[PDB]
Coordinates of C-alpha atoms and ligand atoms in Angstrom, one line a residue:
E1 CA -4.8 -25.3 -32.8
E2 CA -7.6 -22.6 -32.1
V3 CA -7.9 -24.0 -28.6
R4 CA -4.8 -21.0 -29.0
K5 CA -5.3 -18.4 -31.7
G6 CA -2.7 -16.1 -29.7
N7 CA -4.8 -15.3 -27.4
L8 CA -6.1 -11.6 -26.4
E9 CA -6.5 -12.6 -23.3
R10 CA -2.7 -11.6 -23.0
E11 CA -2.6 -9.8 -26.1
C12 CA -6.2 -7.7 -26.3
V13 CA -7.2 -7.2 -22.2
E14 CA -4.6 -8.3 -19.4
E15 CA -2.4 -5.8 -21.2
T16 CA -4.6 -3.1 -24.3
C17 CA -4.8 -3.6 -28.0
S18 CA -6.5 -1.6 -29.9
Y19 CA -6.9 -2.8 -33.2
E20 CA -4.3 -4.5 -35.6
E21 CA -2.9 -7.2 -33.8
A22 CA -6.3 -8.4 -33.8
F23 CA -5.1 -9.2 -37.7
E24 CA -2.6 -11.5 -37.5
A25 CA -3.9 -15.3 -36.5
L26 CA -8.2 -13.8 -37.0
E27 CA -10.7 -14.9 -39.5
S28 CA -14.3 -14.8 -40.0
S29 CA -13.7 -10.4 -40.5
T30 CA -16.7 -8.9 -39.2
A31 CA -16.5 -11.4 -35.5
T32 CA -12.9 -9.5 -35.9
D33 CA -15.5 -6.4 -36.4
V34 CA -18.1 -7.5 -34.0
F35 CA -15.3 -7.9 -31.3
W36 CA -14.3 -4.4 -32.0
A37 CA -17.6 -2.7 -31.8
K38 CA -17.5 -4.4 -28.0
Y39 CA -14.1 -3.5 -27.5
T40 CA -14.6 0.6 -28.7
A41 CA -17.6 0.5 -25.6
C42 CA -15.2 -0.8 -23.5
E43 CA -13.0 1.9 -24.1
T44 CA -13.3 4.2 -21.4
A45 CA -12.5 1.1 -19.3
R46 CA -9.7 -0.2 -20.0
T47 CA -8.1 -0.6 -16.7
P48 CA -7.4 -3.3 -14.0
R49 CA -8.3 -6.0 -17.0
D50 CA -11.0 -7.7 -14.3
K51 CA -13.7 -4.2 -15.4
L52 CA -12.8 -4.7 -18.8
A53 CA -13.0 -8.2 -19.3
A54 CA -16.7 -8.3 -17.1
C55 CA -17.3 -5.3 -19.5
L56 CA -16.6 -7.6 -22.8
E57 CA -18.7 -10.2 -21.8
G58 CA -21.8 -7.6 -20.7
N59 CA -24.9 -8.3 -18.3
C60 CA -22.6 -5.1 -17.3
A61 CA -23.5 -1.1 -18.0
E62 CA -19.9 0.9 -18.5
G63 CA -21.2 3.9 -19.2
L64 CA -23.8 4.7 -21.6
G65 CA -24.5 0.7 -21.3
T66 CA -23.4 0.6 -25.8
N67 CA -22.0 -3.3 -24.3
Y68 CA -24.5 -4.5 -22.9
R69 CA -24.9 -7.7 -24.3
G70 CA -27.3 -9.4 -21.9
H71 CA -31.4 -10.6 -21.8
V72 CA -32.9 -8.1 -20.5
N73 CA -36.6 -7.6 -21.7
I74 CA -38.4 -4.7 -19.2
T75 CA -38.3 -1.6 -18.7
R76 CA -38.0 0.4 -15.1
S77 CA -41.7 0.2 -14.5
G78 CA -42.4 -3.5 -16.4
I79 CA -43.8 -2.6 -19.8
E80 CA -42.2 -6.0 -21.8
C81 CA -40.0 -4.6 -24.6
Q82 CA -41.4 -4.2 -27.9
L83 CA -39.0 -6.9 -30.2
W84 CA -36.7 -4.7 -32.6
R85 CA -38.2 -6.6 -34.8
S86 CA -41.0 -5.0 -34.5
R87 CA -43.3 -2.2 -35.3
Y88 CA -46.1 -2.4 -33.2
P89 CA -46.6 -0.3 -31.2
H90 CA -43.6 1.0 -33.2
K91 CA -42.3 1.3 -36.5
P92 CA -38.4 2.2 -35.0
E93 CA -36.6 4.9 -36.5
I94 CA -33.1 2.5 -35.8
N95 CA -34.0 -1.4 -37.2
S96 CA -31.1 -4.4 -37.1
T97 CA -29.8 -2.9 -40.4
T98 CA -29.2 0.8 -39.7
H99 CA -27.7 0.0 -36.8
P100 CA -25.6 -2.9 -37.0
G101 CA -23.3 -2.1 -34.5
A102 CA -25.3 -2.7 -31.3
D103 CA -26.7 -7.1 -30.7
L104 CA -30.8 -5.6 -31.4
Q105 CA -32.0 -9.3 -31.2
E106 CA -35.6 -10.5 -29.4
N107 CA -36.1 -7.3 -26.9
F108 CA -33.5 -7.4 -24.8
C109 CA -32.4 -3.1 -24.2
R110 CA -29.7 -1.8 -25.9
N111 CA -28.3 2.2 -27.1
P112 CA -27.3 2.2 -30.6
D113 CA -27.8 5.8 -31.3
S114 CA -26.0 6.3 -27.4
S115 CA -28.2 8.5 -25.6
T116 CA -27.5 9.8 -22.3
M117 CA -30.3 7.5 -20.5
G118 CA -28.4 4.7 -21.3
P119 CA -29.7 1.0 -22.0
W120 CA -33.5 1.6 -23.5
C121 CA -36.4 -0.6 -25.1
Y122 CA -39.5 -0.4 -27.0
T123 CA -43.2 -0.8 -25.5
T124 CA -45.7 -2.7 -26.4
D125 CA -47.5 0.1 -24.7
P126 CA -48.2 2.1 -27.4
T127 CA -48.3 5.4 -25.5
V128 CA -44.8 4.9 -24.7
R129 CA -42.0 4.7 -27.6
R130 CA -39.0 4.3 -25.6
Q131 CA -38.4 3.3 -22.2
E132 CA -35.3 3.1 -20.2
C133 CA -34.6 -0.2 -18.7
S134 CA -33.2 -0.8 -15.3
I135 CA -29.9 -2.9 -15.5
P136 CA -27.0 -4.0 -13.5
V137 CA -23.5 -1.8 -13.8
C138 CA -20.3 -3.1 -13.4
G139 CA -19.3 -2.9 -10.0
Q140 CA -22.0 -2.7 -8.1
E141 CA -23.1 -6.4 -7.9
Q142 CA -26.4 -9.1 -6.9
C143 CA -29.1 -5.4 -5.6
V144 CA -32.3 -7.3 -7.7
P145 CA -34.9 -4.4 -8.2
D146 CA -38.9 -3.3 -8.1
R147 CA -38.5 -6.0 -5.0
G148 CA -37.8 -8.1 -7.2
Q149 CA -41.4 -7.4 -10.2
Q150 CA -38.3 -7.7 -12.6
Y151 CA -37.0 -11.2 -11.4
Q152 CA -36.0 -13.7 -14.6
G153 CA -33.3 -15.5 -12.8
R154 CA -34.3 -19.7 -11.4
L155 CA -34.9 -18.3 -7.8
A156 CA -36.7 -22.5 -6.6
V157 CA -37.3 -22.8 -2.9
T158 CA -37.7 -20.6 0.2
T159 CA -36.3 -18.4 3.5
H160 CA -36.9 -22.2 5.6
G161 CA -35.5 -24.4 3.3
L162 CA -39.6 -25.2 1.3
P163 CA -39.7 -26.8 -1.9
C164 CA -41.0 -24.2 -4.2
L165 CA -44.3 -26.2 -6.3
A166 CA -44.9 -26.0 -9.8
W167 CA -47.4 -23.2 -11.4
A168 CA -49.8 -25.6 -13.0
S169 CA -48.7 -28.2 -11.1
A170 CA -53.4 -29.7 -11.4
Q171 CA -54.3 -27.4 -8.4
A172 CA -51.8 -24.8 -8.9
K173 CA -53.3 -24.1 -11.9
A174 CA -56.6 -23.8 -10.8
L175 CA -56.3 -21.4 -9.0
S176 CA -53.6 -18.8 -10.0
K177 CA -56.2 -16.9 -12.9
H178 CA -58.1 -16.2 -10.0
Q179 CA -56.8 -13.3 -9.9
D180 CA -54.8 -10.5 -12.2
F181 CA -51.7 -9.8 -12.2
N182 CA -48.7 -8.6 -14.8
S183 CA -48.8 -11.0 -17.4
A184 CA -44.9 -9.1 -18.0
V185 CA -44.1 -11.4 -15.8
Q186 CA -42.6 -14.9 -17.5
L187 CA -43.5 -17.8 -14.5
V188 CA -41.6 -20.6 -15.4
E189 CA -41.5 -24.5 -14.0
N190 CA -41.7 -23.4 -9.9
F191 CA -39.2 -21.0 -9.6
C192 CA -39.7 -17.8 -7.9
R193 CA -41.5 -15.1 -9.0
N194 CA -43.8 -11.6 -8.4
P195 CA -47.0 -11.9 -10.5
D196 CA -49.4 -9.4 -8.6
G197 CA -47.2 -6.0 -7.1
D198 CA -46.4 -7.3 -4.0
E199 CA -45.0 -4.7 -1.5
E200 CA -43.2 -7.7 -0.3
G201 CA -40.8 -9.6 -2.8
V202 CA -40.8 -13.3 -4.7
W203 CA -42.7 -15.9 -4.1
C204 CA -43.7 -19.5 -5.0
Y205 CA -46.5 -21.8 -3.3
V206 CA -45.5 -25.2 -0.8
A207 CA -46.9 -28.5 -0.1
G208 CA -49.8 -28.4 2.3
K209 CA -53.9 -27.1 1.7
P210 CA -54.4 -24.3 -1.4
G211 CA -52.3 -21.7 -1.3
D212 CA -49.4 -22.2 0.6
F213 CA -46.8 -19.3 -0.2
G214 CA -43.4 -19.0 1.1
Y215 CA -41.5 -16.1 0.1
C216 CA -38.6 -16.4 -1.7
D217 CA -35.1 -14.8 -0.6
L218 CA -33.5 -12.3 -2.1
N219 CA -31.2 -9.7 -1.7
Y220 CA -33.7 -6.6 -2.7
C221 CA -32.5 -3.1 -3.2
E222 CA -32.5 -1.2 -0.4
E223 CA -35.8 1.3 -0.7
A224 CA -35.6 3.5 2.0
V225 CA -39.3 3.9 2.6
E226 CA -39.0 6.7 5.3
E227 CA -37.5 10.0 2.0
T228 CA -67.6 11.6 4.0
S229 CA -63.2 10.8 3.3
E230 CA -62.2 9.1 0.6
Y231 CA -59.5 5.9 0.4
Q232 CA -60.6 2.8 -1.9
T233 CA -61.4 0.2 -1.3
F234 CA -58.0 -2.5 -1.9
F235 CA -59.1 -5.3 -0.8
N236 CA -62.6 -7.7 -1.9
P237 CA -64.9 -6.9 0.8
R238 CA -66.1 -11.0 1.2
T239 CA -63.2 -12.5 1.7
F240 CA -61.8 -10.0 4.1
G241 CA -65.2 -7.8 5.6
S242 CA -66.8 -5.1 5.3
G243 CA -64.9 -2.1 7.0
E244 CA -62.5 -0.7 5.0
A245 CA -65.3 1.8 3.2
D246 CA -65.1 3.5 5.9
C247 CA -61.4 2.3 8.5
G248 CA -59.7 4.9 10.3
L249 CA -62.8 7.4 11.1
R250 CA -63.3 6.9 14.8
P251 CA -67.0 7.1 15.6
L252 CA -67.5 9.2 18.6
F253 CA -64.3 12.0 16.9
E254 CA -63.6 12.4 13.0
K255 CA -67.5 11.5 12.3
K256 CA -68.9 14.5 15.0
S257 CA -66.2 17.0 13.7
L258 CA -63.6 16.9 17.4
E259 CA -60.6 17.0 17.7
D260 CA -59.1 15.0 20.8
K261 CA -56.6 16.7 23.5
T262 CA -54.1 15.7 22.2
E263 CA -53.5 15.6 17.7
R264 CA -53.2 18.9 17.0
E265 CA -50.5 18.9 18.4
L266 CA -49.6 15.7 17.1
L267 CA -49.3 18.5 13.6
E268 CA -46.3 21.0 15.3
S269 CA -42.6 19.6 14.8
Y270 CA -41.9 18.8 18.3
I271 CA -42.0 22.7 19.7
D272 CA -38.2 22.4 21.6
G273 CA -39.6 22.3 24.8
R274 CA -42.3 20.7 24.5
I275 CA -43.2 16.3 25.7
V276 CA -46.1 15.2 26.5
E277 CA -46.1 11.9 29.1
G278 CA -47.8 9.2 28.2
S279 CA -51.6 10.1 29.9
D280 CA -54.5 8.7 29.6
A281 CA -57.3 8.6 26.8
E282 CA -60.5 9.0 26.2
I283 CA -62.9 6.6 24.8
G284 CA -63.0 5.8 21.6
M285 CA -59.9 7.2 20.3
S286 CA -58.3 3.8 19.9
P287 CA -61.4 1.9 18.7
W288 CA -59.5 -0.7 16.3
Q289 CA -57.3 -2.0 19.5
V290 CA -57.2 -5.0 20.7
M291 CA -56.9 -7.3 23.5
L292 CA -54.9 -11.2 23.5
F293 CA -56.2 -12.8 26.2
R294 CA -55.7 -16.5 26.6
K295 CA -58.6 -18.7 27.2
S296 CA -57.5 -20.8 31.1
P297 CA -56.2 -19.4 32.8
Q298 CA -57.1 -16.2 32.7
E299 CA -53.7 -14.6 31.8
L300 CA -53.6 -11.2 29.0
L301 CA -50.8 -12.2 26.7
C302 CA -50.5 -9.2 24.5
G303 CA -52.2 -6.5 22.3
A304 CA -53.0 -6.2 18.8
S305 CA -54.6 -4.0 16.1
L306 CA -59.0 -4.7 14.0
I307 CA -57.9 -3.9 10.2
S308 CA -61.7 -5.1 9.5
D309 CA -64.7 -7.7 11.2
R310 CA -63.4 -10.1 10.3
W311 CA -59.2 -9.8 10.3
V312 CA -56.6 -8.8 13.2
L313 CA -52.7 -8.5 13.2
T314 CA -50.9 -8.7 16.4
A315 CA -47.0 -9.5 16.7
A316 CA -45.6 -13.5 15.7
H317 CA -44.3 -13.4 19.2
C318 CA -47.9 -13.3 20.8
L319 CA -48.5 -17.1 19.3
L320 CA -45.0 -18.4 18.5
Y321 CA -41.8 -18.1 20.3
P322 CA -39.9 -21.3 20.9
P323 CA -37.6 -19.9 23.3
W324 CA -40.3 -19.6 26.0
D325 CA -42.7 -22.2 25.1
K326 CA -45.0 -20.4 22.6
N327 CA -47.0 -22.0 20.8
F328 CA -51.1 -21.7 20.9
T329 CA -53.9 -23.5 19.2
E330 CA -56.9 -21.7 18.1
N331 CA -58.3 -22.7 21.1
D332 CA -56.0 -21.7 23.6
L333 CA -57.2 -17.6 23.3
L334 CA -60.2 -15.2 22.6
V335 CA -59.6 -11.6 21.9
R336 CA -61.0 -8.1 23.9
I337 CA -62.6 -4.7 22.0
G338 CA -63.7 -2.0 22.7
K339 CA -63.1 -2.2 26.2
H340 CA -61.2 0.8 28.8
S341 CA -61.4 -0.7 32.2
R342 CA -57.7 -3.6 31.5
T343 CA -59.9 -5.4 34.7
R344 CA -63.1 -4.8 34.7
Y345 CA -65.6 -5.8 32.7
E346 CA -67.6 -3.4 30.0
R347 CA -70.3 -4.8 29.9
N348 CA -72.2 -3.8 26.3
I349 CA -69.1 -1.6 25.8
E350 CA -66.9 -4.4 25.0
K351 CA -66.7 -8.0 22.9
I352 CA -65.2 -11.5 23.4
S353 CA -64.6 -12.9 19.9
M354 CA -62.9 -17.2 19.7
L355 CA -60.7 -17.7 17.0
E356 CA -60.9 -19.2 13.9
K357 CA -57.6 -19.7 12.3
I358 CA -53.5 -18.1 13.3
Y359 CA -52.0 -17.2 9.9
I360 CA -48.2 -16.4 10.9
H361 CA -46.3 -14.5 8.4
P362 CA -44.4 -17.4 6.9
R363 CA -41.1 -15.9 7.0
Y364 CA -41.4 -14.4 10.2
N365 CA -37.5 -15.8 12.2
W366 CA -36.9 -14.9 15.4
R367 CA -33.8 -16.4 15.7
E368 CA -31.8 -13.1 15.0
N369 CA -34.2 -10.0 16.4
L370 CA -37.0 -10.8 15.1
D371 CA -37.6 -10.5 10.8
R372 CA -41.4 -10.7 10.6
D373 CA -42.5 -9.9 13.9
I374 CA -45.9 -10.4 12.1
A375 CA -49.1 -12.6 12.4
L376 CA -52.7 -12.8 10.7
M377 CA -55.8 -13.5 12.3
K378 CA -59.5 -14.8 12.3
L379 CA -62.8 -14.3 14.9
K380 CA -65.3 -18.2 14.5
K381 CA -68.0 -15.2 13.7
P382 CA -67.8 -11.1 13.0
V383 CA -68.0 -8.4 15.1
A384 CA -70.5 -5.4 15.0
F385 CA -68.7 -1.9 15.4
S386 CA -70.5 0.6 17.9
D387 CA -69.2 4.4 18.9
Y388 CA -67.2 1.8 20.6
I389 CA -64.5 -0.3 18.2
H390 CA -64.1 0.6 14.7
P391 CA -61.4 -0.5 12.7
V392 CA -57.4 1.2 11.4
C393 CA -56.9 2.2 7.3
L394 CA -53.9 0.2 6.4
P395 CA -51.4 1.8 4.3
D396 CA -49.2 0.9 1.2
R397 CA -45.9 1.7 -0.1
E398 CA -46.7 5.2 -2.1
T399 CA -48.5 7.0 2.0
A400 CA -45.9 5.9 3.8
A401 CA -43.3 9.1 3.8
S402 CA -46.0 10.9 2.8
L403 CA -46.9 10.5 6.6
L404 CA -43.4 10.2 7.3
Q405 CA -42.3 13.9 6.3
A406 CA -45.6 15.9 6.9
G407 CA -46.4 13.9 9.8
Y408 CA -43.7 14.3 12.5
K409 CA -44.9 12.3 15.1
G410 CA -46.6 8.7 15.6
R411 CA -49.4 7.5 18.4
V412 CA -48.8 4.8 20.7
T413 CA -52.2 3.9 22.5
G414 CA -51.8 0.9 25.1
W415 CA -52.4 -0.6 28.4
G416 CA -48.7 -0.6 28.5
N417 CA -48.9 -5.0 28.6
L418 CA -44.6 -4.0 26.6
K419 CA -43.0 -3.4 29.5
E420 CA -44.9 -4.9 32.3
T421 CA -43.4 -8.9 31.0
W422 CA -40.6 -7.5 32.8
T423 CA -41.3 -5.9 36.4
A424 CA -43.8 -8.7 37.7
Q425 CA -49.1 -0.7 35.9
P426 CA -51.7 1.3 34.1
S427 CA -55.1 0.7 34.6
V428 CA -56.8 2.4 32.5
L429 CA -55.4 2.8 28.6
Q430 CA -53.1 5.4 27.9
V431 CA -52.1 6.9 25.0
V432 CA -49.2 8.3 23.6
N433 CA -47.4 11.0 20.9
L434 CA -43.5 9.6 19.6
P435 CA -41.7 11.0 17.2
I436 CA -39.9 8.9 14.6
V437 CA -36.1 9.8 15.0
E438 CA -33.9 9.6 11.5
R439 CA -32.2 6.0 11.3
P440 CA -29.1 6.5 11.2
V441 CA -29.7 7.9 15.2
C442 CA -30.9 4.6 15.8
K443 CA -28.6 2.3 13.7
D444 CA -26.0 4.0 16.6
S445 CA -27.5 3.2 19.5
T446 CA -28.8 -0.1 18.8
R447 CA -26.8 -3.6 19.0
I448 CA -29.1 -5.6 17.0
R449 CA -29.3 -4.8 13.7
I450 CA -32.4 -2.6 11.6
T451 CA -33.9 -3.7 8.1
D452 CA -36.0 -1.7 6.4
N453 CA -38.5 -3.6 7.5
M454 CA -38.0 -2.0 11.1
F455 CA -37.6 1.5 12.4
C456 CA -37.8 3.7 15.0
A457 CA -38.8 5.7 17.8
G458 CA -38.9 8.0 20.5
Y459 CA -38.2 11.9 22.0
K460 CA -34.2 12.5 22.4
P461 CA -32.5 11.4 25.0
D462 CA -29.9 13.8 26.3
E463 CA -29.1 12.4 30.4
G464 CA -31.4 13.6 31.4
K465 CA -33.7 12.0 30.2
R466 CA -35.0 8.8 31.8
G467 CA -36.1 6.3 28.6
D468 CA -39.4 6.1 28.4
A469 CA -38.6 3.5 25.4
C470 CA -41.5 0.6 25.8
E471 CA -45.1 2.1 25.9
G472 CA -47.9 0.5 24.4
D473 CA -48.7 -3.2 24.1
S474 CA -46.6 -6.1 22.1
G475 CA -48.7 -6.9 18.9
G476 CA -50.5 -2.8 19.7
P477 CA -50.8 -1.1 17.2
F478 CA -48.0 3.0 16.3
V479 CA -51.2 4.8 14.3
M480 CA -51.0 8.3 11.7
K481 CA -53.6 11.3 11.3
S482 CA -53.1 12.3 7.2
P483 CA -52.9 15.1 6.7
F484 CA -54.5 15.2 3.5
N485 CA -57.6 12.6 3.7
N486 CA -57.8 12.9 8.1
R487 CA -57.9 8.9 8.4
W488 CA -56.3 6.8 10.7
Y489 CA -53.3 4.0 8.9
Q490 CA -51.0 1.9 11.4
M491 CA -48.0 2.5 10.3
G492 CA -46.8 0.0 13.6
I493 CA -46.7 -3.6 14.7
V494 CA -45.5 -2.8 18.2
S495 CA -41.8 -5.4 19.5
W496 CA -39.1 -5.2 21.5
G497 CA -36.9 -2.1 21.7
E498 CA -33.6 -4.3 22.9
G499 CA -36.0 -6.7 25.2
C500 CA -37.2 -3.6 27.0
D501 CA -34.9 -3.7 30.1
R502 CA -30.9 -2.6 28.1
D503 CA -32.7 1.5 27.2
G504 CA -32.4 4.7 28.1
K505 CA -32.8 5.3 24.1
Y506 CA -35.4 4.4 21.6
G507 CA -39.2 2.8 20.3
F508 CA -39.1 0.6 18.0
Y509 CA -41.6 -1.2 15.7
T510 CA -42.3 -3.5 12.6
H511 CA -43.0 -1.5 8.8
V512 CA -46.3 -3.2 8.5
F513 CA -47.2 -1.2 3.8
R514 CA -46.2 -4.2 2.4
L515 CA -48.1 -6.7 4.0
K516 CA -51.6 -5.7 2.1
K517 CA -50.5 -8.5 -0.6
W518 CA -49.4 -11.6 1.9
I519 CA -52.9 -10.6 3.3
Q520 CA -54.7 -10.4 -0.2
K521 CA -53.2 -14.2 -0.6
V522 CA -54.1 -14.8 2.9
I523 CA -58.4 -14.4 3.2
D524 CA -58.4 -16.3 -0.1
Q525 CA -56.2 -19.0 1.6
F526 CA -58.3 -19.7 4.2
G527 CA -62.2 -18.6 1.7
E528 CA -65.4 -16.1 1.9
Ligands
LIG601 C1 -38.7 -12.6 -22.7 O1 -37.8 -13.4 -21.4 C2 -38.3 -14.8 -21.2 C3 -38.1 -15.5 -20.1 O2 -36.8 -16.0 -20.4 C4 -38.0 -15.4 -22.4 O3 -38.4 -16.5 -23.9 C5 -37.8 -18.2 -22.9 O4 -36.5 -18.2 -23.4 C6 -36.1 -19.0 -23.8 C7 -35.5 -19.0 -24.6 O5 -35.0 -18.4 -25.7 C8 -36.5 -20.5 -23.2 O6 -36.0 -21.3 -22.6 C9 -37.5 -19.8 -22.3 O7 -38.5 -21.1 -22.1 C10 -38.6 -18.6 -22.6 N1 -39.7 -18.4 -22.0 C11 -40.7 -18.5 -21.8 C12 -41.2 -17.8 -23.2 O8 -41.5 -18.1 -21.1 C13 -37.8 -14.0 -24.1 O9 -36.5 -15.2 -25.0 C14 -38.0 -13.2 -24.1 N2 -39.0 -12.2 -24.5 C15 -38.4 -11.7 -25.9 C16 -39.2 -11.0 -26.6 O10 -36.8 -11.3 -25.6
NAG602 C1 -35.3 0.4 -42.3 O1 -35.6 1.3 -42.2 C2 -35.0 2.5 -42.5 C3 -35.6 3.7 -42.4 O2 -34.8 4.5 -43.3 C4 -35.0 2.9 -44.4 O3 -33.8 3.3 -45.2 C5 -35.6 0.2 -44.3 O4 -35.0 0.0 -44.9 C6 -35.5 -0.3 -43.3 N1 -35.0 -1.8 -43.4 C7 -35.5 -2.8 -42.2 C8 -34.7 -4.2 -42.6 O5 -36.7 -2.4 -41.3
NAG603 C1 -47.6 -27.0 18.7 O1 -48.4 -27.7 18.4 C2 -48.9 -28.5 17.5 C3 -49.9 -30.1 18.0 O2 -50.2 -30.5 19.0 C4 -48.6 -28.7 16.3 O3 -48.9 -28.3 15.1 C5 -47.3 -27.6 15.8 O4 -46.4 -28.7 16.2 C6 -46.5 -26.7 17.2 N1 -47.3 -25.4 15.6 C7 -46.3 -24.6 15.0 C8 -46.9 -23.4 14.6 O5 -44.8 -25.2 15.7
MG604 MG1 -5.4 -13.4 -16.0
MG605 MG1 1.1 -8.9 -30.8
MG606 MG1 1.4 -6.5 -36.3
MG607 MG1 2.1 -7.0 -34.0

C-alpha cells in the first residue's frame, strides 16, 4: 500500500510538519533528505497550502529561488546556460558534489549559494560567468517575457486559428537559414518560435506561397515603452530598396541647414499658454507623405507614408474593412506622392505610381478595436526621389521612449482625410504638432481599450477647448524629430479616434517600432 504512505499532503502541507514525522513510515533515506532540501527552501511559504504545494513542485520562484526544479535553459538576455556538468567556458566553483543540495542537472537555472539575485546559470558566453534567469514567480501566473524570445513552450497555431508548418517541411528548411537568427532558441517540430529577435513576438509558417507566416497569440508582459547624419542600415537594400541610408533628411530643410517655421516650437514643453493650429505646410516639409486614390471612380481613399523607393505603409482598414465592403485588389488602386494641392495635379512635382502587391499585417483584427491597423504596398516600378519626394526613417524599441521622453511633441501632416469621411475641408497640406499624452490620462477618457500597441496624443481639454481630435489623413504619418541624429522618424499610423465623432478629447495612432522584422520577412517573401 504505497498509494497510501501516510501522505504528507495532510501531514506535511495541508498543515506544516518540519521532519521527524517524515520518518514513521518513510524509506529511501536520502530521498527523505532531497524532500527536506526542497522543504527547507519553501520554508517562508508555509501558509496557505496551495502556495507551499506549488512551491515544492518547483516551476516557481520563491524568495531567493533555491526551490526551483523546473527546466529553463536561458538567461535574462538570451545567452544559453552552460551545462553544470561543464567547464567550457567556465570551470565552476560549485560542482554537483560540492553543493549536492540543489538540483544541478543539465543547464537549468538554480541557486545553490542563494545569491540575492536569485536563480542563475553559467554562460555559453566566455565574457559572462553567471547571468541570472527570469523565472515565473509564484502567484503572478502567465506573463511571457522578452517578446517570446525565451519561449520554450508548445504553441502550434496562429491568432487566426491556422496550423503552423514544420520547421523543416521540405521548403521550410529551404528558406530557414536564408537569414541569421539566435541559435540559443530550440526550433522544435512546428511550434511557435522567435528566432530573429522579432520585437512583435513569436510566430511560425503557414500554408500558401513560400514564406507565409501568421503570428502566435501569447500573453507577453506589458512593455510600457513610454517610460551627414549617422543612422545604420537595418534593411537589405536589394529587397527593401534604397533610401534608408539617407531617410528622414528633408531635401529642402535638413540638407539646406534650414529649420521650418514650427519645428523649433516642438522642443519646448507646452509653454503653458501657446497652442498652434493646423495651418498650411510649406513645401518639402512632409515629403514621404502619400495619397491613396481609387482608380475608377477617381476617389481619394487614404493617407500613407513613403519608407523607401519601393515600400509604403498605410492603415489596413483603407483596403480591408468588412463592416463596409472594402476589399481592394492591386488593380483597384494607385498612389500619388509629393503632392501639395489636394485637387490640382502637380505637373512634374508629383509622381503617380501603381501597386504590385498588398500585404495586410496578419494579426490585423477589426472585429474589436482595429488591432494592428497596418498594411504594406509595393510599387510596380520604383520611385525617383527629389526635393519633393523623400522617405521617412523607421524607429526601433530603443528610439521609442528616447523620443517619447526628450521630445515632448510630434506632428500630423495631412489633408484632413480622416475627418472628412464623415462631414460630407483643407485644400492644401496642413501641418500640426500635438503633445503625447500620459497613457493613464488617455485610458480613462475612452471606452475602446488601449493595448501597448496603440497610443494617444493632443492638447488637454478644460471645458472651453473644442476637440481638434482627428487631425490628419487616415493611414498617414505621425512623426517625430530626433534631437540627436537629426532625422524624422514615423511613430504612428493614424486610426479612427473613437470613430472621430464622439470626441471632445484626444487623438489615436498605432505604434510602428515593433514592425521592423515583420517587414523584413515580407520584402523577402515578395523577393528582391
Ligand atoms: C534546452 O532546451 C531544450 C529544448 O527543450 C532541451 O532539449 C530537449 O530535451 C528533451 C528531453 O530532455 C527532448 O524531448 C527535446 O527533443 C530536446 N530538444 C532539443 C535537443 O532541441 C535541452 O535539454 C535544454 N538544454 C540543456 C543543455 O539542458
Ligand atoms: C569540485 O570542485 C572542487 C574544487 O574545490 C574539488 O574539490 C572537487 O574535486 C571537484 N569535484 C568535481 C566532481 O568536479
Ligand atoms: C477580395 O476578393 C477576391 C475575389 O475577387 C479574393 O481575393 C478575396 O476573397 C478578397 N480579399 C480578401 C483579403 O478577403
Ligand atoms: Mg487538500
Ligand atoms: Mg504523524
Ligand atoms: Mg514521531
Ligand atoms: Mg508522530
